[PDB]
Design a protein around this ligand. Structure first.
Ligand SMILES: [Ca+2]
Length: 744
RNA sequence: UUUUUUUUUUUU
């Protein structure tokens, strides 16, 4: 058939005028047409696809009609650099925009992409580190185009998919784009990708910067731009060949630095507040490192009882009502004692002066202890400059730094990226799901330490997720290692949900894991701490912190359905429960039930017993078991580490011998936050890949006619069985004969 | 009453 191939070649040539998503499926579908024998059938299937191609070809033409007017406000400094960047984007595959806080590049960058003509044949993805950053930026570009969000400009987050068929700009969290990679590895949905706030150097951000480097050869038609602050924009250019950089000014008033080093710590803060009161009676933002540190400074400043003041705290876990109190109205004098939330996420309003002690809690993975550590460290130069920048908003400000300039200049320029200091267990799991087994070959922007990667590989083996196909360093995951990839939860938690089906507890396991994936919805406010406890202690199980979630879950589900929507938000307030988190605890549970149902795992309708729910949970907590010390309230855990039970635990008063905790974190000691009693008999059937068997005192016993010994099974060093006499002859007959021969 | 409290966040 040569005329049939003319209708074939002419059709593909037309197919270049379609959306990239459509252009792929039709091109494959045509390549399977000549496979059919009958040419009479072919002429019937070209005619149909051309009818479907015609709809798709018209789809883009209709789409171009919905392109709106392009408007750039003259307030923003980026509107001046607009002509410089626009030329750079069309001419270069990769462009990098870095600007100060005032620039307004974030809102106007999607507009320049549209002015270039992108967004019609394929979507333009814009990625933000937090949800609200994705949501507010979308709502802002809609405002500036006299359209409403979800239309031309849309945003997708974990539970809101506000996108339409005429959408051209897609705001989203960086993790959303990652979830889309398994389904669409070539990212054919998008015509251009803009990555914003890349200076934060998140684990997702760093992984995206690698994956995009890998597909650029297979996606020449797409162009990509990465955006950040003026902090190390040359790393990004080096990553993508030598990509062009464009810098934009910011609208901020000048800030002055005053280095004043050195209860000696608390006294230094007093002198700083006294100095600021002389020069002006303005707001002071004092960065604080912890709830205990914010509580000690708050009691100190309120103890002085300054006449015209208000001591107002702000931290991440604070009540959404009490947190949003800072964003109301300035009256009298306000000094806000805040933590990192005021450095990146929140941006506290009405600030004139900022006091920087230069200390912050940073999360680190100790590949010695294999435990998450939260030390209080000196912050980086960039972190101090970010704190310094949170004070110049509307009027001229000054920033006082409570340390010497030589200390500041001695500090690293930038904080360590997250990929370098967290466990890569889930990271490598998702990589193996995509076929990216060789982690050394993956083009990281900052490659992690080799020993750090292997810790993740070991944890996956601990969960049964990974194996190698007798290769050197390219892994292939197991059938449940792929199911662990399908659940959007921590690998430890995903593993217990899978093991949950062998026992009658999939509902309970989904409740537990969902709760452990959020900040604790139960709130313990700074005032009425004991009052909060009596309200929270209604559901405490005598020996299981995990079961407390189940009781609380059934309670809230029953009260949500029994009374109104407004009366429920009140019941959340009167029981010290964050409504939004209680809501999200349900949304994760609902998402789990989807994939759990989609994988065919049956979910129970009956309540389960204590042993089955917790045996299922133990599957993800094998490194998190401990044995109590005799006549001591301390625990010996995995390896030779020692941890104490968290004080807010239902079994803190009466700690059993054998425990499992959900989380081990080291601050001053090693704390096991969510804990429950376990029987050591349970640990052996699940740790077959981990147990180490040692045999001792071998002797020949006449009655049974075999050699006997005392065996001690050991997981991560812990004696699950201290000793039990067993016939050594069945265990290793050759060795027993050799001992019998040598008379021993 | 024998141990008295943990930075910021993202999704398949
Ligand atoms: Ca929609």
């Amino acid at each position: 058939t040569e005329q049939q191939k003319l209708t074939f070649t002419a059709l593909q040539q037309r197919l270049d005028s379609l959306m990239l998503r459509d252009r792929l499926r039709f091109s494959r579908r045509l390549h399977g047409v000549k496979k059919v024998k009958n040419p009479d059938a072919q002429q019937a299937i070209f005619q149909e696809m051309a009818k479907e191609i015609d709809q798709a070809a018209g789809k883009v033409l209709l789409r171009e009609a919905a392109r709106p007017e392009i408007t750039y406000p003259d307030n923003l400094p980026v509107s001046q650099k607009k002509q410089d960047i626009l030329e750079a984007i069309r001419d270069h595959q990769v462009v990098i925009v870095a600007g100060e806080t005032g620039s307004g590049k974030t809102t106007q960058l999607p507009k320049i992409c549209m002015e270039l003509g992108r967004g019609i044949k394929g979507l333009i993805g814009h990625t933000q580190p937090r949800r609200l950053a994705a949501r507010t930026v979308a709502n802002r570009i809609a405002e500036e185009l006299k359209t409403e969000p979800g239309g031309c400009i849309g945003y997708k987050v974990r539970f809101s998919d506000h996108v339409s068929d005429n959408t051209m700009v897609k705001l989203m969290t960086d993790g959303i784009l990652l979830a889309e990679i398994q389904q669409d590895r070539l990212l054919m949905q998008y015509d251009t990708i803009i990555i914003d706030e890349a200076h934060e150097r998140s684990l997702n951000i760093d992984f995206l910067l690698g994956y995009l480097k890998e597909l650029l050869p297979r996606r020449p038609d797409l162009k990509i731009i990465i955006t950040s602050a003026t902090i190390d924009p040359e790393r990004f250019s080096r990553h993508f060949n030598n990509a062009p950089i464009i810098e934009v000014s910011g609208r901020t008033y000048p800030v002055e630095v005053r280095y004043r080093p050195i209860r000696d710590q608390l006294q230094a803060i007093f002198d700083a507040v006294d100095e600021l009161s002389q020069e002006s009676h303005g707001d002071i933002l004092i960065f604080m490192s912890g709830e205990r540190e914010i509580r000690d400074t708050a009691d100190a400043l309120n103890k002085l009882n300054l006449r015209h003041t208000e001591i107002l705290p702000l931290y991440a876990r604070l009540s959404n009502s009490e947190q949003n109190r800072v964003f109301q109205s300035h009256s009298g004098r306000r000094i806000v004692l805040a933590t990192n939330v005021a450095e990146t996420s929140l941006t506290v309003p009405g600030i004139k002066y900022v006091i920087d002690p230069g200390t912050a809690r940073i999360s680190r993975y100790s590949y010695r202890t294999k435990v998450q550590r939260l030390p209080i460290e000196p912050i980086s130069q960039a972190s101090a400059n970010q704190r310094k920048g949170r004070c110049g908003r509307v009027s001229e400000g000054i920033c006082i730094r409570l340390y010497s300039e030589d200390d500041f200049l001695s500090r690293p320029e930038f904080t360590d990226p997250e990929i370098l200091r967290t466990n890569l267990a889930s990271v490598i799991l998702q990589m193996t799901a995509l076929g990216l087994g060789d982690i050394a070959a993956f083009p990281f922007v900052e490659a992690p330490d080799k020993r750090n990667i292997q810790d993740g590989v070991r944890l996956l083996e601990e969960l049964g997720a990974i194996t190698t196909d007798e290769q050197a360093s390219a892994y292939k995951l197991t059938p449940l290692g792929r199911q662990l990839s399908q659940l959007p939860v921590d690998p430890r938690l995903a593993r217990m949900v899978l093991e949950a089906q062998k026992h009658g507890c999939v509902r309970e396991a989904m409740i537990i894991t969902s709760a452990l994936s959020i900040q604790d919805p139960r709130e313990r406010p700074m005032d009425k701490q004991q009052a909060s406890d009596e309200k929270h202690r209604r559901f405490h199980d005598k020996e299981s912190d995990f079961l407390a979630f189940v009781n609380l879950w059934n309670y809230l589900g029953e009260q949500q359905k029994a009374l109104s929507s407004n009366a429920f938000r009140r019941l959340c307030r009167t029981d010290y429960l964050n409504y939004l988190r209680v809501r999200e605890w349900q949304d994760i549970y609902t998402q789990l039930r989807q994939v759990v149902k989609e994988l065919g795992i049956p979910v129970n309708s009956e309540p389960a017993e204590y042993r089955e729910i917790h045996i299922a949970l133990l599957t993800g907590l094998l490194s998190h078991i401990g044995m109590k010390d005799a006549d001591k309230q301390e625990y010996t855990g995995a390896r030779n580490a020692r941890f104490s039970i968290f004080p807010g635990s239902g079994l803190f008063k009466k700690p059993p011998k054998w425990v499992m905790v959900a989380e081990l974190v080291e601050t001053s000691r090693l704390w096991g936050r969510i804990a429950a009693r376990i029987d050591p008999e349970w640990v052996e059937p699940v740790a077959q890949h981990l147990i180490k068997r040692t045999y001792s005192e071998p002797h020949w016993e006449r009655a049974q006619g075999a050699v006997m010994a005392t065996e001690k099974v050991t997981v991560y060093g812990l004696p699950i069985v201290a000793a039990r006499k067993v016939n050594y002859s069945q265990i290793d007959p050759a060795l027993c004969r050799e001992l019998f021969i040598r008379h021993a």
